[PDB]
Amino acid sequence: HMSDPMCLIENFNEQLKVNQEALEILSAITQPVVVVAIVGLYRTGKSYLMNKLAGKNKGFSVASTVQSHTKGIWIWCVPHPNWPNHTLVLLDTEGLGDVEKADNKNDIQIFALALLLSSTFVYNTVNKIDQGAIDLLHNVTELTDLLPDLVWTLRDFCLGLEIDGQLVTPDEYLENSLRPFPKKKCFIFDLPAHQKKLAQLETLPDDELEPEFVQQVTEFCSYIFSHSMTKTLPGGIMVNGSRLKNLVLTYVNAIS
Amino acid sequence: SDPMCLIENFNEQLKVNQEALEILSAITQPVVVVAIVGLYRTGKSYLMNKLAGKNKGFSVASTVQSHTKGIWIWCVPHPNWPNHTLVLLDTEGLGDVEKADNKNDIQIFALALLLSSTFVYNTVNKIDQGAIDLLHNVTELTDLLKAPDLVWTLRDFCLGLEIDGQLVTPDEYLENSLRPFPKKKCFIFDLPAHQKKLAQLETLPDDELEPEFVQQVTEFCSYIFSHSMTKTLPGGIMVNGSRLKNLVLTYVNAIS
Ligand SMILES: Nc1nc2c(ncn2[C@@H]2O[C@H](COP(=O)(O)OP(=O)(O)O)[C@@H](O)[C@H]2O)c(=O)[nH]1
Ligand SMILES: Nc1nc2c(ncn2[C@@H]2O[C@H](COP(=O)(O)OP(=O)(O)O)[C@@H](O)[C@H]2O)c(=O)[nH]1
Ligand SMILES: [Mg+2]
Ligand SMILES: [Mg+2]
Structure with a gap:
């Protein structure tokens, strides 16, 4: 569908406001949706990895x-x-x-x-x-x-x-770390490349990355593509793009 | 000659080690106390050995x-x-x-x-x-x-x-980051080994370390050696080893 991503939720001076153009694209999706979200500390390669889930070299902007x-x-x-x-x-x-x-x-x-x-x-x-x-x-x-x-x-x-x-x-390290989310999984990733190539990492072909890193990413992607389930809501209802639109509005309004 | 444990932490009970207290109380010279704190697995112990000018000391692992x-x-x-x-x-x-x-x-x-x-x-x-x-x-x-x-x-x-x-x-990155410790300084360190051959770092000579990293560690050490002052109590009282020992006893109690 989309050739590039777009902002779904703006945050200009810390106000969570939806973006209508993205909302309209969502409600035009009548298929069931698999929703993969990424969270973690800033400056941590998040945008760069998500682009791998898309199969494209660029997408979410990385700096x-x-x-x-x-x-x-x-x-x-x-x-x-x-x-x-x-x-x-x-x-x-x-x-x-x-x-x-x-x-x-x-x-x-x-x-x-x-x-x-x-x-x-x-x-x-x-x-x-x-x-x-x-x-x-x-x-x-x-x-x-x-x-x-x-x-x-x-x-x-x-x-x-x-x-x-x-x-x-x-997976056992993760399990050991949480002892005193029913489905859990843990993937490791090497340093993608030597430290001075890290800023241009986006432009580097697989050839020039750490070979193990490339396989670890393919491993991460394959697991997602073959185990990540359709977004589900209570009562055995299956979420399509329209229903996800409503959840976005529901949650944004409830948070603010 | 080798570090020793000052405060034991078996079963998360903080307790003073009398042997380390007794070494401290025999030091009559003024003391420059340099402490390192950070999240675990962050190479603290490795860096502190550099201040001692000895390739081994605080155990790393x-x-x-x-x-x-x-x-x-x-x-x-x-x-x-x-x-x-x-x-x-x-x-x-x-x-x-x-x-x-x-x-x-x-x-x-x-x-x-x-x-x-x-x-x-x-x-x-x-x-x-x-x-x-x-x-x-x-x-x-x-x-x-x-x-x-x-x-x-x-x-x-x-x-x-x-x-x-x-x-x-x-320094400016630190200052920008802290902008809404009177004296402050900041130092960057490259990845030390240009191979994630980090687990044996303690055994490598400087010529196998990343050269920029060797130079960065030297500047850190030089600053500590030139800028760090004798520990001082209120009233300009200067702390020697004997006084530091009683500081340890006071604060271990105040923390309990
Ligand atoms: N050390 C390291 N750097 C990375 C990794 N992935 C990407 N980078 C670089 O880290 C910088 C920030 O990446 P970015 O995707 O913007 O991180 P984000 O802020 O978490 O979204 C960019 O220069 C990337 O090229 C990684 O796995 N390790
Ligand atoms: N990536 C990285 N690893 C380091 C660095 N310094 C030491 N190491 C390695 O990190 C591991 C932990 O070192 P250690 O000093 O015991 O960490 P500590 O728990 O903070 O005291 C050891 O394998 C070291 O060889 C560094 O600057 N960067
Ligand atoms: Mg990002
Ligand atoms: Mg340590």
Whole structure:
């Protein structure tokens, strides 16, 4: 359908306001939708990875400075690569913890909204699983209840996957980290390239990336394309683009 | 000659180690106390050994699990300031997912802060708002428990230092990030090894490390050696080893 993404939810001075042009594109989708949203700290490769789910080299804009780039929530509606009569809806979002914004409540509001619209929720962190990232995920989850399948991605991962002398998979690392989201999954990613090639990463063909990184991305994408389910609402109703439009309006209005 | 544990943390019970207290009380020279704090698995222990001018000291280790526990102390001669002892504090990193005791983290944070005359705050990739909020929270809390130079170290730094179209020094990046610790400084460090051969980093010589990283560590160390001052109590009272020991006892109680 769409050749580029567009802003679904604007955030100019921290006001969550829907964008009509994107809303109108949503309601013209009568197919069931798979909604994959991405959330994590800012400057963390989120936009760059989501473009991989689209199969295109560019899409959500990625930038290379210390300053945040993505604002609000962005949407890309494309045919599901495996699944006939299904549309893949990608939600790319403004990273949390931007020091120039310094507005945790706006952060929490963007988080909650991406978590409410998604059927697959991609939580993007760097190096390792941090307790603060778990606590934030938990707290937004509790707020989201009072008003999806978890894919925890670990970027620039090099620590030994080793707990008390035993080699573990990322999935077992994630499981070990959450002991005292029914469907959970955890994907690791190497440093995509050497550090001085990182700013131009978008323009680099697979040839010039870390070979393992390329396979880890294909692994991440294949899992999504073949396990991420149609967005579902209580009462065995299946969400199409029109119903997702209503949820966007419902949730935006309830948050503000 | 080798660091020893100052504050033990078995079962998240903070307790003083009498052997380290007794070494401190025999130091009559003024002390320059440098403490490092950051999230776990962030190369704190590795960096602190650079200040000691010894390739080995504080133990590092390379798996997803936390390694350093409690607070370790290492009293070494100041490299260029006669009759001054450089007291290095290496701390258990924050946010360890196996710990399930957020209160214990904050107490280690407060203790390191209360004892330091130079406080090194070690973060990865970027300054993020959660790290500032945590610094502010703990700084506010230590002023109650009392009823210091800040050096922000940015590890694995690749983002462009450019804000609103203008190049920034690390100092300016810190200042822009903190804009709504009287003395403040900031330092960037490249990825040290241009191969994620990071797990054996402690064994490599400088010629196999990233050269920019070697030069960045030297500048960090030079600043600590030239700018860090003797720990000072209110009233211009200058802290020697014997006085620092009683500081440790006072604050361990105030934190309990
Ligand atoms: N270290 C690292 N950098 C990345 C990765 N993916 C992308 N980048 C670079 O990180 C910078 C910010 O990426 P971006 O997609 O804008 O991150 P976002 O702010 O989280 O959406 C860009 O210069 C990217 O080229 C990764 O996996 N690791
Ligand atoms: N990526 C990266 N790894 C590092 C750096 N410094 C040390 N390491 C590696 O990171 C791991 C953790 O080091 P350690 O000092 O024990 O981390 P700590 O828990 O913060 O004390 C070890 O494998 C080190 O070899 C760095 O600047 N960048
Ligand atoms: Mg982005
Ligand atoms: Mg350590």
